[PDB]
Amino acid sequence: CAAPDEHCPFVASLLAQREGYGAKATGGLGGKFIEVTSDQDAGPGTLRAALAQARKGPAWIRFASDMTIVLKTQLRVPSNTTIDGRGKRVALIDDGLGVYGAKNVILTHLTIDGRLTRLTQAVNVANDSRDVWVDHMDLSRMSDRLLNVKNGSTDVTISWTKFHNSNKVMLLNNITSKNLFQNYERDSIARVTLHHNYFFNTVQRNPRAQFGTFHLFNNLLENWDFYGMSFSLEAKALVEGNIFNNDAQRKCVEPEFYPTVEGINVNYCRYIPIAPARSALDNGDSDRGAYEKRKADHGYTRDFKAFLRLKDNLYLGDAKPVLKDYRPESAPTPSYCYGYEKATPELAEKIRKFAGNTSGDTPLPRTGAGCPGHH
Ligand SMILES: CC(=O)N[C@@H]1[C@@H](OC(C)=O)[C@@H](O[C@H]2O[C@H](C(=O)O)[C@H](O[C@H]3O[C@H](C(=O)O)[C@H](O)[C@H](O)[C@H]3NC(C)=O)[C@H](OC(C)=O)[C@H]2NC(C)=O)[C@@H](C(=O)O)O[C@@H]1O
Numbered sequence: 001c002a003a004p005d006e007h008c009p010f011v012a013s014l015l016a017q018r019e020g021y022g023a024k025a026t027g028g029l030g031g032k033f034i035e036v037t038s039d040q041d042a043g044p045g046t047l048r049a050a051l052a053q054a055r056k057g058p059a060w061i062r063f064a065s066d067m068t069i070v071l072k073t074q075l076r077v078p079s080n081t082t083i084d085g086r087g088k089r090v091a092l093i094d095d096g097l098g099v100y101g102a103k104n105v106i107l108t109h110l111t112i113d114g115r116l117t118r119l120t121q122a123v124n125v126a127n128d129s130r131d132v133w134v135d136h137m138d139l140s141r142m143s144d145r146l147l148n149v150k151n152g153s154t155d156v157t158i159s160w161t162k163f164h165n166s167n168k169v170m171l172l173n174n175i176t177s178k179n180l181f182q183n184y185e186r187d188s189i190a191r192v193t194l195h196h197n198y199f200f201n202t203v204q205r206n207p208r209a210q211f212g213t214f215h216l217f218n219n220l221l222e223n224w225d226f227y228g229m230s231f232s233l234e235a236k237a238l239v240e241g242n243i244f245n246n247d248a249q250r251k252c253v254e255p256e257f258y259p260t261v262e263g264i265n266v267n268y269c270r271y272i273p274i275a276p277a278r279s280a281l282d283n284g285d286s287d288r289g290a291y292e293k294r295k296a297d298h299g300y301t302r303d304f305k306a307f308l309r310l311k312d313n314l315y316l317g318d319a320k321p322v323l324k325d326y327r328p329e330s331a332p333t334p335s336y337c338y339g340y341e342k343a344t345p346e347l348a349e350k351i352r353k354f355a356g357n358t359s360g361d362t363p364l365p366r367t368g369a370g371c372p373g374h375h
Contacts, residue, residue: 004028004060010086011060014108017364018133019338020193020215022157025133027082027106031058039067047075047083047092054081063088071095074120077105085109085357096122096142099129108135111357114142114166116259121145129153137161138357143259150174152186154212157193162356164200167258167268172209172235179298180233180291187211188234194219195338196362198355199228201253203268208286209235209306213332217241218341220351221279225254225268229280229323231306232287238309238331239323241343243351245316246276276318283308283326307331314343337371339364 001008006015006029015026034053038045047069050061058080066089074095077083079102091111095118099105112122122139125132126148132155139146139161146163147170149156163169173187190212197219199206204226207214210233218241221228228244231237252269259265284291284305291304308323309331315321341347354362367374 001033003031004033004082005030014084014086014106017135017159017362018157019364020157020159020195020334020336021155021191022131022133022193023336024155025104025106025131025157027104027133028054028058028060028080029082031060031080034059034061035064036061036067037064039069041070041072051075051077051081054078060084063090066090068093074098074124076100077102077107079103079105082106082108083110089357094118095120096124098124099126099132100124101127102129102132104131105129106133106135107137108133109137109357111138113138113140116141116143116255119144119259119261121148123147125149125153125156126151127153130155132156134158135160136355136357136362139163140165142166144168146170148174149190149192150187152189154190154192156191157195158197159194160196160355160362162198162200163202163206164198165202165253167203169199169202169205170207171205172207172214173211175210175287178294180287180294181298181300181302184211184234184302193334193338196351196355198222198351199224203254205230209237210287211235214238215332215334215338217338218343218347218351219243220245220348220355222246223250225252225275226271227275227278227281230286231280231308231323232284232304233291233306234302235306236331237306238311238334239313240309240311241313241340241347243314243316243343243348244279244319245314245348246279246319248273248276248318277320278322279315279319280322282322283324303327312343314348316345316348333369335370337366337368339366340368341365
């Protein structure tokens with residue numbers, strides 16, 4: 001490991017774990033190592049300085065020591081870059097990572113905690129970004145968003161990541177026009193795989209997904225305060241082997257208030273007793289009102305609902321099923337090979353143990369249509 005090539009064992013070990021729509025990402029493979037030696041927001045040896053250097057050519061960024069990096073603005077991640085916090089405890093505080101117009105990016109083993117300090121995002125994959133792998137992250141306390149994949153971005157895998165202690169967690173595409181399908185051609189190309197993630201002590205949008213093609217398998221949603229998942233507007237999703245666990249009688253752990261653009265907002269603690277039955281919003285409910293009000297003038301021929309195929313999802317504790325198959329024939333049958341596990345309480349335990357920015361290893365356990373010899 002003089003360089004991040006296929007012969008470097010920790011490069012090879014990481015790349016062996018790839019699966020899903022982001023599985024082609026190699027980040028800084030074949031480029032240079034850059035070792036972050038300063039924990040400052042900016043300056044020599046900083047993460048920000050490393051990312052600037054990474055604009056010049058493929059870079060695999062590692063950290064010299066455990067560090068807390070208090071960010072004043074969001075970091076911008078260029079193409080062909082890996083940010084690799086393995087072997088160290090690295091936390092980004094108050095701001096996060098923007099992946100804008102970038103191809104071929106791997107983010108692994110980092111903590112990002114917004115502390116509700118400012119209106120920003122932990123991981124923002126936007127504006128024609130592609131081939132992005134978000135792995136073993138620990139993301140929390142963003143007053144805007146933990147993670148977006150939006151605005152013509154595609155070919156993304158989110159794996160083994162702990163999303164916690166935050167309100168509006170994840171958007172898979174957004175809506176920025178009154179005509180709900182105005183950006184459909186642009187955003188329907190989004191292909192995103194979510195597997196082995198842990199959504200714990202969050203409020204909502206776990207994820208909220210529209211327009212694109214999504215595969216959610218073997219995720220654990222636990223102790224949400226408002227709703228778990230939401231799908232609408234011809235999202236096409238295969239939702240399989242996930243575990244939803246909740247209890248209507250538990251102590252609230254939300255902050256007293258949330259900062260917002262319009263000022264201070266109350267928390268969602270009063271919804272705890274009705275949250276378990278809202279494992280998801282009903283299919284299409286996120287945008288149904290707008291769709292029904294606007295369909296007269298816009299003449300929508302696309303569905304307000306998502307096309308869903310659901311298999312082998314658990315509903316534990318007080319959690320109750322909501323989502324059912326709807327036009328399942330139009331949901332994806334992913335072209336790739338993936339390591340699907342039967343949904344059991346033992347799987348939930350595995351996810352709680354290993355999801356996030358953890359020290360233990362998560363090698364792939366694989367059959368399916370995309371698996372040569374093992375269909
Ligand atoms: C139990 C229940 O579902 N009650 C809701 C109301 O929820 C409240 C008052 O908490 C209310 O729902 C609207 O407000 C929600 C909220 O305050 O968090 C959600 O809104 C957030 O997300 C939507 C979204 O489309 O995803 C928008 O971006 C909102 O701006 C955002 N608001 C804030 C403060 O962050 C509800 O949206 C979703 C998707 O669940 C939002 N509902 C709608 C249709 O816009 C109420 C209402 O319609 O205003 O509906 C129920 O009674």
